[PDB]
């Protein structure tokens, strides 16, 4: 009889004490602000239509974030752009921005002997 | 669940396992790490495009027929034909399989966005803004990068299209 | 609290944490056994007038009968009641496909020779318990009789 | 000045996993593994050798498996660090000691420079890149027909501002007059498709006439 | 990055022959790249200097 991972979705404790519980895999009928995600029943999060960027992963496209209450949403992949393609049309940059971007790479781990 | 695997519902077996200590947690922890790494791997391949570019409806790509690799408009999943071909061709004991973060439709959206950008704007949507370029001129500059002077495309464009259309 | 407890930390960073595994624990206990009304005991096995000699051990199939083993184990007669693969306290919770009862007599200090995997005159030349024996060995003094 | 306001998690995971691995290896010394005590001095005060040996063998078994787990975890995670180190060495070579034509190998946009900076157990690359900005739409053509011969851009793209035609470099709008210096000829102009008509300028033609 | 979002001068990184374009396609647990490449054909011998 049914079992699953009790996953606590939390903001930082610095931000808030409220948390939501994802009961992985189980359907909400068997669990006992209740939402049947395709990852499992999520208790204590509010379903919202607005597809924000993914803050905390849940699964199957649902993510959760704090907005104060925990909200759960199907994440957005980005804004939508037809580029106005036409067989006679070129776009050319008239200016530029020098951006300096930071890429951080591991190079070592601590040397240990036991 | 290391306890469900080793024991099932058996309080005495579960208690004996506590004497072996953190080994039950180390496995849950290591598999959690592998699991989050899979979403990271998928994101770093497909989320290279920050903006879901769309194709125009008029597919006037200079004779090149992308119909097998662009999305099918008749389908809810928005796979291409070659994606649909690929996705066709290729319990209780405490194990569980977790759903990926990005659904197959989200990977199709990203794959569509990378392809739409590529055919409508070339490299530019990668290197910044998706500056559109007519596809024949994009191919002519791709030719210029392989050391073949760009007239060799325009003077052979119907052949180059027919070779590409056949190869797809 | 479960998150704080599983991270071994009094503070938690933003995330999703697999704090616990739930299971819809069983509401009630069923018991089901065959509706066998026969009680036919080991009585004629324990209390026979003469037993077999050890070389020709008398074997009786106790079968298709209920057997309370507590009324055996409570008998103060049984100086040895060594069991293997099953424990006396639980025998009444089990049911068995067949229960062969093998009965014979041997000199007192030689009783210790009977146990599975032992060797010597009984175990070598008269009656050998297999190393994967599941069963109980019952022995009691009979100088008063034999 | 913006780097002050801004990936360290991918590096802190190294510090945090080595810490958690050692901490877990120390905590497993408290584990009994079926022995009557976790501390061997208990076994050896409580019991004499013939009984202690079985107790010690349980502790040895569980401690040796704890330590083989650690060393297996570290060997795996060291292979991951060496992948990151070889990538960092390649970035040092190709982004710092060079300029890279490899798209997104040295940050977003077209790579100019990279500067290395030391970090704890890591390297930080400040990739300086050219990101093009302020797009304008222009009408474009693959070739100009002049006097029946097809002119193509020698290095660039033909653009029209509606009225005129110009050559520009592709990645920045500097409009230049279409000339036999800025264009090259291949074939008669019937074979190309999408062609347009505009008067290419020969610098010799005015200069010779100015004699 | 190098075959879709770019064009690669790296021999064999984006198929056999000189790389033109690559198109990404999704697959189960994977990505399929359709590398479009220019392969030269119909050699003729010439004297050179
Ligand atoms: C390429 O052009 C489109 C269309 O812009 C219109 O046509 C131009 C020739 C010019 O007359 C514009 O003023 C027209 O609006 C561009 O889309 C426009 O983008 C601006 C923002 O820059 C926006 O305010 C307008 O609403 C857009 N117009 C339409 C009809 O959608 C497009 O940005 C250009 N493509 C690229 C890659 O730069
Ligand atoms: C190119 O873009 C830059 C950045 O936006 C422009 O520089 C700014 O110009 C405004 C006036 O229009 C000034 O107030 C800012 O101080 C400038 N910024 C810097 C960093 O100097 C520049 O004018 C643009 N050039 C063209 C030709 O469009
Ligand atoms: C691109 O190629 C496809 C595949 O050959 C063409 O689509 C086919 O067209 C015929 C004729 O109308 C139909 O009978 C097929 O059913 C179509 N196949 C599919 C999968 O739709 C398409 O016409 C080509 N593009 C152009 C512009 O001609
Ligand atoms: C280059 O090779 C190609 C491929 O063999 C030739 O293309 C074919 O040309 C014939 C006419 O000669 C057409 O009927 C075919 O349709 C062409 N193929 C395709 C895929 O369209 C081409 O002729 C050759 N060109 C030269 C100059 O040798
Ligand atoms: C063998 O005979 C004896 C004596 O008749 C039986 O003794 C009984 O044993 C049970 C179980 O220990 C006791 O509860 C009774 O009080 C005993 N009765 C007497 C009068 O002592 C014994 O039951 C017989 N053996 C078996 C296996 O039934
Ligand atoms: C296209 O660009 C050309 C060159 O800058 C423009 O032509 C100039 O226009 C000004 C008046 O606006 C005249 O004083 C110049 O003599 C013209 N130069 C030449 C070489 O003809 C033209 O106006 C631009 N057209 C648009 C629509 O922007
Ligand atoms: C581009 O220029 C060519 C050459 O001047 C034009 O072709 C001529 O067009 C006239 C008018 O139709 C004909 O009388 C000539 O016989 C054509 N010459 C040739 C060699 O074909 C062409 O029409 C122009 N195209 C555009 C769009 O302006
Ligand atoms: C905790 O909250 C305070 C505000 O009360 C904030 O200034 C601080 O940065 C927070 N710390 C962390 C680690 O988030
Ligand atoms: C549980 O819910 C899902 C939809 O969220 C449904 O597909 C499934 O049939 C339900 N029942 C079981 C046993 O999974
Ligand atoms: C989300 O969308 C559904 C329709 O698909 C709508 O019924 C629901 O009210 C929306 N949720 C909120 C919080 O508005
Ligand atoms: C562009 O497409 C239109 C159809 O929409 C066609 O009539 C025209 O000839 C094409 N021009 C070029 C330069 O490809």
Residue numbers in the entry:
A (entry chain B): 590 to 621, 641 to 675, 690 to 736
B (entry chain C): 737 to 826, 854 to 931
C (entry chain B): 297 to 442
D (entry chain B): 932 to 937, 944 to 1148
E (entry chain C): 1030 to 1078
What does the report in the manuscript say about this coordinate set?
Alpha and Mu have a P681H mutation (681PRRAR685 to 681HRRAR685) at the furin cleavage site, while Delta has a P681R mutation, making the furin cleavage site 681RRRAR685. The efficiency of furin-mediated processing can be ordered: P681R (Delta) > P681H (Alpha and Mu) > P681 (B.1 and Gamma), in broad agreement with other studies using authentic live virus particles and viruses generated using reverse genetics. Delta (34 ± 14) and Mu (35 ± 16) had more prefusion S trimers per virion than B.1 (20 ± 10); Alpha (23 ± 12) and Gamma (27 ± 13) had similar numbers of prefusion S trimers as B.1. Taking the virion diameter into account, the density of S trimers (per 1000 nm2 surface area) in Gamma (1.5 ± 0.6), Delta (1.9 ± 0.9), and Mu (1.9 ± 0.7) is higher than in B.1. The majority of S trimers from all strains have all three RBDs in the closed state (hereafter, closed state), ranging from 73% (Mu) to 88% (Delta); the Mu variant has the most populated 1-RBD open state (hereafter, open state), constituting 25%. The D950N mutation induces a structural difference between Delta/Mu (which both contain the D950N mutation) and B.1, indicated by >2 Å Cα RMSD. When aligning the HR1 residues, the position of loop 940–945 in Delta and Mu (N950) differs to B.1 and there is a change in the rotamer conformation of K947; these changes are not observed for Alpha and Gamma (D950). The fusion core at residues 936–945 in HR1 has been reported to be critical for the conformational change when S transitions from prefusion to postfusion and we speculate that the D950N mutation may modulate this transition.
S glycoprotein trimers protrude out from the viral membrane and are the major proteins on the viral surface, making it the main target for vaccine design. Sequential cleavage of S at the S1/S2 site followed by the S2’ site within the S2 domain exposes the fusion peptide (FP), which mediates host-viral membrane fusion, allowing entry of the viral genome into the host cell. Overall, the S-trimer structures are similar to those previously determined for B.1 in situ, and are similar across all variants.
